[PDB]
């Protein structure tokens, strides 16, 4: 297999994942049958290092995947994007950590919650961690998890990063009763007095520096993309896919409807939505590609580009959502029924919107600072 054949296989899955969207929403977590299928065609290998049988691929092709997934099932696209990018994150961890996860089984999955909703206290050999983390999309389908939060040594915050912990050392509290992305199963992770070895903590600082241990062995270009582009993009890409899905739905339904042998108003709003969605994607995937092309040539990623990515990325979410709102309003009465696909895309996108990577202001201030000749702050870049 290679990157392109995995994409082809994913195309083939779309119709079945689509028909399952209701059931997916019902389960409040991905159906085992779709996760298995994904796993079987190689989706999770996509951004996985080749030392573990993976494809350590071009990041643009991976998001292009998630966009397809989200274009038939919001929750499927959302979880896939997030779980997949974890196999990219784990590659920046040092060999020891990687070994524990994929040693006996390379198709092992990791979930996460990067918001600092807990902490790890220094002991001999690493960390003693406690906290309750929420929103771990797809945690129901993973054997390990990351959790974000500071390192506290003798009181006070020294580092901030992610801790890697096994399913057996955290409880999963089912509190996923929300208005959108219902089937993401983004439950809550309870960590009590769990020791985590020093080789299962990765610093963001380290990642920024290109001194993350795992890079020695995993030297493919893709493992040097900035977290600030890679992570928020994992959030925006599926949302963009949701707009594509909402668009196709509405077009189908509006097509039959306007074959009655004029209605300029209906045409305009479809042309505008189509163009805004296209602009979202071009920018999002475009900044991703500009950065990977640079790394591929051995060159370095200038701050200006990372800042442009952040502002375009929050913007992409904005215009995907605005388009979906206009396509929803236009679908009229028949979009109100609990089964109607367009209303699902609309609910899902709005749920996704609350994710922190989507806060427009945060991202615009970073880009605004850079244009105005100001020192960087916000590390989410």
């Amino acid at each position: 297999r290679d990157a392109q054949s995995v994409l082809a296989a994913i195309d083939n899955l779309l119709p079945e994942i689509r028909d399952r969207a209701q059931a997916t929403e019902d389960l409040r977590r991905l159906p085992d049958e779709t996760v298995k299928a994904l796993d079987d065609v190689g989706f999770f290998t996509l951004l996985q290092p080749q030392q573990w049988g993976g494809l350590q691929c071009d990041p643009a092709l991976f998001f292009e995947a998630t966009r397809r997934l989200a274009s038939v099932c919001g929750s499927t696209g959302w979880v896939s994007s997030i779980v997949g990018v974890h196999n990219w994150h784990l590659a920046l961890f040092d060999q020891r950590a990687q070994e524990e996860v994929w040693g006996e089984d390379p198709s092992t999955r990791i979930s996460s919650s990067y918001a600092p909703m807990g902490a790890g206290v220094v002991v001999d050999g690493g960390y003693l961690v406690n906290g309750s983390w929420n929103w771990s999309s797809g945690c129901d389908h993973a054997s390990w998890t990351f959790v974000g939060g500071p390192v506290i040594k003798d009181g006070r915050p020294v580092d901030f990063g992610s801790f890697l912990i096994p399913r057996s050392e955290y409880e999963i509290k089912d509190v996923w009763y929300v208005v959108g992305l219902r089937g993401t199963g983004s439950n809550t992770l309870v960590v009590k007095d769990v020791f985590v070895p020093r080789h299962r903590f990765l610093s963001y600082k380290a990642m920024n520096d290109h001194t993350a241990g795992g890079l020695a062995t995993n030297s493919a270009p893709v493992y040097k993309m900035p977290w600030g582009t890679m992570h928020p993009t994992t959030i925006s890409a599926p949302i963009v896919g949701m707009a594509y899905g909402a668009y196709a739905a509405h077009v189908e339904h509006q097509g039959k409807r306007v074959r009655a042998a004029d209605d300029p108003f209906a045409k305009v709003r479809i042309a505008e939505a189509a163009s805004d969605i296209d602009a979202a994607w071009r920018q999002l995937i475009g900044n991703v590609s500009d950065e990977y092309a640079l790394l591929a040539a051995g060159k370095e990623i200038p701050f200006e580009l990372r800042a442009r990515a952040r502002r375009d990325q929050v913007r992409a979410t904005g215009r995907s959502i605005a388009s979906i709102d206009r396509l929803f309003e236009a679908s009229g009465a028949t979009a109100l029924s609990n089964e109607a696909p367009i209303q699902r895309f609309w609910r899902d996108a709005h749920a996704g919107r609350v994710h922190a990577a989507n806060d427009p202001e945060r991202a615009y201030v970073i880009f605004g600072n850079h244009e105005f000749g100001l020192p960087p702050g916000d590390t989410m870049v």
Copy 2:
């Protein structure tokens, strides 16, 4: 010289053209200086056929040029784009028409007014043209002009296209007293009982077919580019350049302010305003130029351009204009009181874009119906 060095030389014209902006406006048409500088650097040869010394370039580079020009002077960018693209249109005329225009002096320029404000009636060996055509940008700097309209036979139209007429067979009436694009000198061409030979008419139909006569000797891929993308983009590219100009102006001004205030307010909204406009401007340009390059790449590979792509180009192009103007308005508002001065560039960029917006190729509805119809399955 090639396309790339012409692009490079145009960068070095930018500062002087910038400084000339007010003079340009006050003239109510382009200054001889600037027209001569563009000619000398080879700008007008960009889309000109090879057999005449032209570079028959990648259409995307021509448009990058117009963008840069318009980012310092709205009127220059607007005129340059329009008169430049006419060297493209003429390539499609059959050789004889070309010979009359370039045969003695290959640097000869042509203007146009494409909206149907007259007509040609069939007679022995051509047509009898009558009409009054407005909005001929840079007409004072051309010695031929295109005029658009139907060919009428015995009462009903039997064709539609462009008539190529020399300086001496039409009158220029100065009517350019407007709120924006004042330097464009977009005056009115008056044509009375003028005979045009058939080899100086060109059907739009004949361009779509690829039956247009000039195509035989002018074989480069650029000349297979669709009229429906080339002409509207010629209008959009400069409007987007103006948005770039507006942006740079507002950032230079506002930047000196946020710095300095950085020593004992905090105006997060000044940065939101700036991040949003740069994003929307980038998007306009990516789509506008993106569509150009997709089409050209197809042609370069001896492939054909699918109808759906041509319809995306139209929806994107009118949208591009819209993104630009909307972004310029936000920037203009954000510049506050200083932007009102007659000598502040941002109010010129703003008036210019709004004046450019009234062009037919920018009507959004008309383009959106086209893309909608295609989406919906309709004709």
Copy 3:
């Protein structure tokens, strides 16, 4: 007892009604206790003729009632407005029809489905009625219904209006499973080969004519108000009400987070102002109309046109402001129990009616502005 006291009494039901919102949503119809309480304080009497113990009130006070209800429970306010204006409509039917509905018990309620999803075929003594009408909000709580349709006389439509049919002659099909307005129970009404007497049909023409049989016995100025304002307003008023509900909900929660960001202040202020604007216009137009009727004057067509352009605008404004507050609410708004997402979901469901369509209203108004003649019958 009068409209102001009914109004003040409605204030008291608000806390109970707000707390019942979730139970109302789960029930998929209004809980019996809320219908009972509304009947107790006299809400259904508000637009009802005096001969039936009704208050035949100034309609601005009725709509102000629905707004208050919708600000604590979107479904309650929606159902109350619609069922409540039905007592206005019946007053226009001739005396005998009112007799049959209210003579025995004046507290009897009526539901509707006005869209023409069936028809009435002329027969001996009246009509034979057939169809399946959807979206009958509050039908579970009514013992009669209106269904909209044409009158068919020998295969050709000769009239259009409403037929009034008793519970025993139609079936209620439970099909109400929706993203919002869950508590409205807008189920479907199945009507098979049902005879309706001539006196239980009212033409819309006759309602515009002022020849509706009921005006002889019910001469209060409120019954002379135009259907084109009254009906669409019973849809818009509650929606505006929901915006008020969403606003209060968001200010309360966000207000504590703050006693712990100018951005939050801006969203809230634009939202507050756009909501206020929507209400002022919607209720202003209704009040101006009634004032003329009450003075003995006629309503000019231009006021009616304005009512309609403002009415669909009020909805747009309300829904945009809700959309902004709901976004601002962020993560908390996602829990299935969050009141703000209910308002958000209820508002967008109400938007599909059907009478919030802006184009139709705006065409009516544009035509009038352009001096074009009245064509469309509104609604």
Copy 4:
């Protein structure tokens, strides 16, 4: 003569002022002819106290008049509202200051520049005032001016207000070369070492407290009206008026194209949607802009006090009115297409004029919106 009389008379001034519109722009200040006619119909007496022969009128009628004037000539509506309102502001100064201004000639006019671009230093019996104040609309037509700034006692700001200064003690610098409101002649005021006595300064705080001197002789309810409503509304009213002007320019032009295609034959829903939305939005700018003023005045005329929440609501609605007017004008102007680019097209003038007006400090949206949000949230509070 009363306030309704003056209004009626202003109506018959409209066509002339409309006709003058272009001449006005080119002058870069209002024509003596206009100013003279406004004076003669009694426009400037509207908010002037009765002791000076003024009408001390219902301020809603005042703002209505500026709307009307601004609906035919933006500059004229702009200058008129601003200079007219100064007769209101002067009413709050000490009786002595009113005497100096209107003692001989009750029709004398005042201009202003209210932003702190200078300062007054405490000296015996008054202040020593220095500064360069820009943007003084209509100054070429006034013989007095207000200039705003803090009072500096021993090098520290200890109060804030307006200083009243006669023409002989300041220079009018001509610098008005702008893209819009060309005819307002909003030039610069230079004041160098000018003594201003105690009684020709008015603290904003004192206006708020109701301790301003003028209240001793001017008891009419209009003078209890808040500065934070009167001053910003004077900026917004004319702008809404410009929006009314553009609306009618557009409607009469567009109507031909739409009626012509009404049978043969293109249908044009877009054009009517666009006109319905603007009309509704302009109507909404006016309802709340004038409603807040009416609600305020209705309280004062009945001896009641104005609650802070109305003043805060007034401010959110006033900057919001400006915004709505400008968004609507933008849409109408775009829609009017190529004939609207002409130097003689009124709409392009309304468009440039409204966008010039927008830069005024009283229109900044965030400041007003922060005031209103603070109040909704409990936060402690100015305005203008």
